[PDB]
Structures are given as structure tokens and as C-alpha cells.
């Protein structure tokens, strides 16, 4: 191809504590990725893994999001998704999608980032 | 026991998890091909001017997908950064361990073509 693969994110927004949100990311082209993951970063903090998924469905979750977040892919649409239930204000961050392909060198691609804002409840 | 290099970076198929680190394994069922834009960027990273020295571009095409020698493996830290770990001696670096070699090949080939 001529242009690099681009990860287009969507689904960030505003929610009250306890509400639900959904993230989506679609990769341009028809590339096959070894790994796809979601990372998040609050200002002044390190970017941290939220959840990643291998090409055959094996998932890893951060301890703080297990049983609340769920990652899935539709490789036919070159898409990865993140379901987020019971959101807490500490989940507020810019969320980034990552896709990694390997051909000797590892090729790592990143989405533009979308912000999830969880306010306090009541 | 893979760990990323100190500090921040300077801007089968399934991965294998060791600790919180991810060892990225090659998938033999497909062949990833990087875009031309990436090949040009890699060309400039190893000293090629693609506009002025197109005759050197074949070295960027070979070097960009160069297999990792020995027991080097690409890894991913908990922040998502890519690094390379030598499972033979525990050495870690941010760059592809063949990039320096291809920088030197670019230099030799440039002189070979005057």
C-alpha cells in the first residue's frame, strides 16, 4: 500500500458514575494484526494498558477494569471494540487503540485518541 | 524476563506474556507488508535521501522487514512501547537490532555508486 494504516477511534463521551460507554476502532486497509489493545492516559500520568486481545481471542485485562470492561474484535471488519460498564471517575482518561503487526520489525499503530469523562454521581 | 530499556523511548501468531510484558511472535500464516510511506520514513531513518538517492532505496526495503537475529524478540511494555529483547543475554534496546547494520550498508553502497 501507499498510505500507512490508520486507526480511527470513536465512542468517547461523557457519562455519570455507574453508566456505560462503548469505544470502537477500525483499521484502514486489510492488514492482519497480531495484537490489538486499548490504552488510557490521564494528564500527567503514564499511558497504561486497559485491555488487549490476540488474533485468536486471548484477552488480558488491567486489574482495575476486569469484570467491568470487555474487549472484542471483528477481524472481518478490521475492528476492535471496548465495552465499559460501571464506569468510575478514576476511569477518566484519553483512550487509545493500538494495533501491532510483526514482520521481523514490530509495526505499532495508534489511534488519534478519544476522551472518556466520568463525572461523579448524584 | 524481558524488561524495557530505562527511561522513555526516543519518539503461531499469538503474543506470549511474561510478567506484564508482551513478547510479540511472528505469524507464519500471513506476511505483513508495510506501506510505501513507512518505507520512505525508514529510509530517512537510516540515512537515505529518497528524492536524491533512489538507487539506495532497495536497502530500506530490505532493512525495514529484516528478521531479528539470534534470540532477539520484539516486546511491548505495559505502556504500549515497542522494544527489543535479547533472550540470549538479557540486553534491551529501543531500536531494531539490525538498523545500525543497515545504516552502515547505506554508507558503503553510497560510495560504491560514487
Numbering used by the authors:
A (entry chain A): 0 to 121
B (entry chain G): 1074 to 1084, 2 to 104
Study authors write:
One of the earliest steps in cilia formation is the recruitment of tau-tubulin kinase 2 (TTBK2) to the distal appendages of centrioles through CEP164 that is located at their tip structure (Bowler et al., 2019; Cajanek and Nigg, 2014; Oda et al., 2014; Goetz et al., 2012; Yang et al., 2018). TTBK2 recruitment requires a conserved WW domain in the N-terminal region of CEP164 and a proline-rich region in TTBK2 (Cajanek and Nigg, 2014; Oda et al., 2014; Schmidt et al., 2012). The structures of CEP164-NTD revealed a two-domain organization in which a WW domain is inserted into an α-helical bundle consisting of three α helices. Despite an element of inter-domain flexibility, these two domains act as a single unit whose stability critically depends on the core interactions within the helical bundle.
To understand in more detail how CEP164 and TTBK2 interact, we determined the high-resolution structure of the CEP164-NTD in complex with TTBK21074−1087 by X-ray crystallography to a resolution of 2.4 Å. In the structure, neither the WW domain nor the α-helical bundle of the CEP164-NTD revealed significant conformational changes upon binding to TTBK21074−1087 (apo- and TTBK2-bound structures superposed with an RMSD of 1.03 Å over 99 structurally equivalent residues). The CEP1641−109-TTBK21074−1087 complex revealed a strong similarity to class II/III WW domains. Like these, it contains two XP grooves with the aromatic residues CEP164 Y73 and W84 defining the XP, and F75 and F77 the XP2 groove. TTBK21074−1087 adopts a polyproline helix II conformation and packs with core prolines against both grooves: P1075, P1077, P1078, and P1082 stack against CEP164 F75, F77, Y73, and W84, respectively, with P1075 occupying the XP2 and P1077-P1078 the XP groove. An additional contact between TTBK2 and CEP164 is made by R1076, which forms a salt bridge with residue D10 of CEP164, probably facilitating P1075 docking into the XP2 groove. D10 positioning is enabled by Q11 (mutated to proline in nephronophthisis), which hydrogen bonds with residues Y73 and D10.
